[PDB]
Amino acid sequence: GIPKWRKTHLTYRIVNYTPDLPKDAVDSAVEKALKVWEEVTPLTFSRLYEGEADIMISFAVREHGDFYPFDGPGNVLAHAYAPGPGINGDAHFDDDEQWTKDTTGTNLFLVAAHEIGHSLGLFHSANTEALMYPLYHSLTDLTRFRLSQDDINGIQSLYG
Amino acid sequence: GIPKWRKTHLTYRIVNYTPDLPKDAVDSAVEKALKVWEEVTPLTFSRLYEGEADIMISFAVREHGDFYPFDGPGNVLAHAYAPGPGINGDAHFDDDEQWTKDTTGTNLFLVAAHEIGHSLGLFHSANTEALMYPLYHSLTDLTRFRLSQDDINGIQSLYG
Ligand SMILES: CC(C)C[C@H](NC(=O)[C@H](CCc1ccc(-c2ccc(F)cc2)cc1)C[C@H](CCCCN1Cc2ccccc2C1=O)C(=O)O)C(=O)Nc1ccccc1
Ligand SMILES: CC(C)C[C@H](NC(=O)[C@H](CCc1ccc(-c2ccc(F)cc2)cc1)C[C@H](CCCCN1Cc2ccccc2C1=O)C(=O)O)C(=O)Nc1ccccc1
Ligand SMILES: [Ca+2]
Ligand SMILES: [Ca+2]
Ligand SMILES: [Ca+2]
Ligand SMILES: [Ca+2]
Ligand SMILES: [Ca+2]
Ligand SMILES: [Ca+2]
Ligand SMILES: [Zn+2]
Ligand SMILES: [Zn+2]
Ligand SMILES: [Zn+2]
Ligand SMILES: [Zn+2]
């Protein structure tokens, strides 16, 4: 079993942008989310501006080309696929959500970090404070965010 | 993508039993859980008493031969793998839980039905009342259980 990338150097591409935030803010959020994982593993990510990258990142609403259509405001916020070729490893964000860079609304960085966890092969955690918990919740202060030991052990068991 | 069985006739085997309930009660719970899905799809399940079946069902505690050890009482109640050969499609139940046939404790039938959903290729639902919701909750009256329309649409989109 054990679904994981057979390589440690991964590429990603931000296929399109959400109009909720300025371009630079989307880039920063995605970059930060990736750094969260690079800090505790031997993985590195390189950005591509064309073609197909291992991790294709996009914002879409309702039916968007795959088997799982989004559901409008609320409920499912995004979805990501486990490691593998093609659609696998990709992360889609529901643009019917209002993506933010702060504590209000739906914070892009927080959700992006979680989705990338799935793209790397992680399942959910039972720890209510773990990044990989199933339900989203906003933080009072973003600087209070940190990976729980559960998150670290999980990703390290897969890579190193 | 779309992880699903390439066949509609599946076999299952109850590899071992939990001492929490009498044998006949475990068989009944598993049988009922399978019937839940047979009622809304063209799938059929046949029981095997030896060798490897597509869906291997077992009760275990802590480290049990796979990559994901159980965690003692509470937290993760069980885990099942998506369709595929070998360990894929299998469902493991944490025996550190007290499995019951009624509304108290951890109801085996309810959890088994959910796990089988995963074994068939389903992901979680955002509907708090759907069988495929991420968090377990006991019912006041078992006869009040029924698949939500979300559960039905999901399994039917995969099979028929
Ligand atoms: C019952 C759930 C639907 C509830 C819903 N949750 C989601 O939307 C999740 C949110 C993920 C998340 C969790 C914790 C933190 C966090 C924040 C701060 C922090 F400090 C720590 C952690 C951050 C992000 C996104 C998807 C859902 C995948 C669903 C299953 N599916 C379908 C599918 C299709 C294709 C591929 C895979 C899959 C697949 O898995 C995922 O889990 O990745 C939720 O909370 N909604 C919500 C919350 C508040 C307000 C409004 C709505
Ligand atoms: C944050 C969660 C951990 C919380 C926890 N949830 C679980 O344990 C789930 C329970 C499933 C379930 C949900 C609803 C109903 C129901 C009941 C009545 C009804 F009317 C309708 C519905 C029935 C069953 C089982 C696993 C967890 C998979 C975890 C991720 N992992 C690891 C992994 C390893 C290998 C393979 C795959 C996977 C994989 O996915 C799964 O989702 O299948 C919970 O609730 N605990 C709890 C609740 C109450 C008291 C004590 C504890
Ligand atoms: Ca991909
Ligand atoms: Ca949504
Ligand atoms: Ca939006
Ligand atoms: Ca199997
Ligand atoms: Ca447990
Ligand atoms: Ca037990
Ligand atoms: Zn999608
Ligand atoms: Zn998730
Ligand atoms: Zn297991
Ligand atoms: Zn589940």
From Swiss-Prot, chains A, B:
Q: Which residues form the active site?
A: E115
The subcellular location is: Secreted, Extracellular space, Extracellular matrix; Nucleus; Cytoplasm
Segments crossing the lipid bilayer: none
Q: Which residues bind Ca(2+) 1?
A: D20, D95, E97
Q: Which residues bind Zn(2+) 1?
A: H64, D66, H79, H92
| Protein origin, superkingdom | Eukaryota
Please tell me where Ca(2+) 3 binds in this chain: D71, G72, G74, V76, D94, E97
Q: How is it modified after translation?
A: Directly cleaved by HTRA2 to produce active form.
Q: Which residues bind Zn(2+) 2?
A: H114, H118, H124
User: Could you say which residues bind Ca(2+) 2 here?
Assistant: D54, G86, N88, D90
Q: Which family does it belong to?
A: Belongs to the peptidase M10A family.
Could you tell me what this protein does?
Metalloproteinase with a rather broad substrate specificity that can degrade fibronectin, laminin, gelatins of type I, III, IV, and V; collagens III, IV, X, and IX, and cartilage proteoglycans. Activates different molecules including growth factors, plasminogen or other matrix metalloproteinases such as MMP9. Once released into the extracellular matrix (ECM), the inactive pro-enzyme is activated by the plasmin cascade signaling pathway. Also acts intracellularly.
Q: What is known of its domains?
A: The conserved cysteine present in the cysteine-switch motif binds the catalytic zinc ion, thus inhibiting the enzyme. The dissociation of the cysteine from the zinc ion upon the activation-peptide release activates the enzyme.
Pathology noted in the record is:
Coronary heart disease 6: A multifactorial disease characterized by an imbalance between myocardial functional requirements and the capacity of the coronary vessels to supply sufficient blood flow. Decreased capacity of the coronary vessels is often associated with thickening and loss of elasticity of the coronary arteries.
Instruction: Quote the protein name from its UniProt record.
Output: Stromelysin-1
Interval of the full protein contained in this chain = 105 to 264 of 477
